[PDB]
Write a protein that binds this ligand. Structure first.
Ligand SMILES: Cc1cc2nc3c(=O)[nH]c(=O)nc-3n(C[C@H](O)[C@H](O)[C@H](O)COP(=O)(O)O)c2cc1C
Ligand SMILES: Cc1cc2nc3c(=O)[nH]c(=O)nc-3n(C[C@H](O)[C@H](O)[C@H](O)COP(=O)(O)O)c2cc1C
Ligand SMILES: Cc1cc2nc3c(=O)[nH]c(=O)nc-3n(C[C@H](O)[C@H](O)[C@H](O)COP(=O)(O)O)c2cc1C
Ligand SMILES: Cc1cc2nc3c(=O)[nH]c(=O)nc-3n(C[C@H](O)[C@H](O)[C@H](O)COP(=O)(O)O)c2cc1C
Lengths: 173, 173
C-alpha cells in the first residue's frame, strides 16, 4: 500500500502541514509506504514557468503513479488554495489521480473561507480524474494548538482527523 | 488614469496574454497610463515561497495602489486559473483591489471549464476587495487565430473584447 502526502503551504513549518504530519504517523503505524513532498522539493523556476521537463516532477509523477492514495493539504489564501500548490497540480499529467483516493486537508482563518477552499479544490481534483474525493478536514486556525513541535489539536479536530484517516484507509482497502 | 495589466500564463507568448495585448493597445489610444506585468518580472523563489519582502512585489504593489483598474488574464489550468498567477495574487495586501475595477480575461480548451474559471476567479478577486468585477471575456482557444504575431481574433471574440473594454473604460469614468 503506498500513499503520497503533499504539503501545499509555502511556510516551514506550516499549520496545514501539521495535519499531514499526524496523518503520516497514523499511516506508518498501519504498514503503509508513505512518500511526503512539499514545495521545497522542486525548483521554483520549474513550477512558476510550468516546465514539464522538471527533474523532480518526473520523480514525483513516478511515485504518484504507483500510489493508491494522495493526502493533500493547503492553507486558505485569498479564499482558496495556495497558488504555490496549484503550480504543482498544474504540472501533473492529465488523469494523474485516476484510480486513486484523495483526502483533502486545509487550515484557514475563517470558517466561511474553509467552505470556499473546499468548493475550490474539488473541481481541480476532479479535473485530475480522482476516483473519489473524500469529504476532508477543513479546520480554522484556533483548532491547531501547536504546529511547531509535536502536532497538537483540539479534541474535536483530532477526532475529525482520525475519522477521515479511517475513512481514507478503508477506501483504499 | 492608470491601469495595470497582469498576464497569468507561464507561457511566452501566450494566448490569454494576446487579449491583454489588444487591451493595452485600445487603452493607449485613450490616453491611459498602462503598466504591464507578467510572471517573468518576479523572482520565482519569492513567488513559490510567498516572500513578502520581494523587491518586485514592492514595486508592483506601489503601481497597483495608484491604479484605477486591473485587467488580469489567465489560461484555464485544471479547470481553474493558473497556479502561477495565484502565487502573485496571494502576495498582494489585503484590500489590494479596494476601490478598483477589475476586468478578468481567460482562454481555455473547453467552454465548460471557461465557466469554471469564471466561478473560481470571482471569490479570489472578491477576497482582495475589488470594487467591481466585470463580467469579463472567457474564450475558447479556437477563437484566437494568432497570438504569436499581431493578435488576431474571430469577429465574435473581437466584438466581445471591444464591448468589455468599453464597459471597463466607462466604469473607470
Ligand atoms: C497570504 C495569506 C493569505 C491568507 N488569506 C486567507 C483568506 O483569504 N481567508 C482565511 O480565512 N484565512 C486566510 N489566511 C490565514 C491562513 O489560511 C491560515 O493562517 C492557515 O492556517 C495558514 O496555514 P499554513 O501555516 O499551513 O500556511 C491567509 C494567510 C496568509 C499568510
Ligand atoms: C481571515 C484571515 C485572512 C488573512 N489574509 C491575509 C492575506 O491576505 N495576506 C497576508 O499576508 N496575511 C493574511 N492573514 C494573516 C496571516 O495569518 C498572518 O500574517 C500570520 O501571522 C502569517 O503567519 P504565516 O506566514 O506563518 O502563516 C489573514 C488572517 C486571517 C485570520
Ligand atoms: C498544463 C495545462 C493545463 C490545461 N488544463 C485545461 C483544463 O483543465 N480545461 C480546459 O478547458 N483547458 C485546459 N488547458 C488548455 C488551456 O487553457 C488553453 O490552451 C489556454 O488558451 C492556454 O492559454 P495560455 O497560452 O495563455 O497559456 C490546459 C493547458 C495546459 C498547458
Ligand atoms: C480541455 C483541454 C485540457 C487540457 N489539459 C492539459 C493538462 O492538464 N496538462 C498539459 O500539459 N496539457 C493540457 N492540454 C493541452 C495543451 O493545450 C497542449 O499541450 C498545448 O500544445 C500546450 O501548449 P502551451 O504550453 O504553449 O500552452 C489540454 C488541452 C485541452 C483542450
Amino acid at each position: 500500500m503506498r500513499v503520497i502526502t503533499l504539503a501545499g503551504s509555502p511556510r516551514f513549518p506550516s499549520r496545514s502541514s501539521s495535519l499531514l504530519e499526524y496523518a503520516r504517523e497514523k499511516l506508518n503505524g498501519l504498514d503503509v509506504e508513505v512518500y511526503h513532498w512539499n514545495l521545497q522539493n522542486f525548483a521554483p523556476e520549474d513550477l512558476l514557468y510550468a516546465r514539464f521537463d522538471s527533474p523532480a516532477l518526473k520523480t514525483f509523477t513516478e511515485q504518484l503513479q504507483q500510489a493508491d492514495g494522495l493526502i493533500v493539504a493547503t492553507p486558505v489564501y485569498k479564499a482558496a488554495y495556495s497558488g504555490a500548490l496549484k503550480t504543482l497540480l498544474d504540472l501533473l499529467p492529465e488523469r494523474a489521480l485516476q484510480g486513486k483516493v484523495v483526502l483533502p486537508l486545509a487550515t484557514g482563518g475563517t470558517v466561511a473561507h474553509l467552505l470556499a477552499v473546499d468548493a475550490a479544490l474539488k473541481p481541480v481534483l476532479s479535473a485530475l480524474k480522482a476516483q473519489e474525493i473524500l469529504h476532508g478536514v477543513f479546520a480554522d486556525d484556533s483548532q491547531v494548538i501547536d504546529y511547531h513541535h509535536r502536532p497538537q489539536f483540539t479534541p474535536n479536530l483530532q477526532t475529525r482527523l482520525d475519522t477521515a484517516l479511517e475513512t481514507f484507509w478503508q477506501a483504499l482497502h
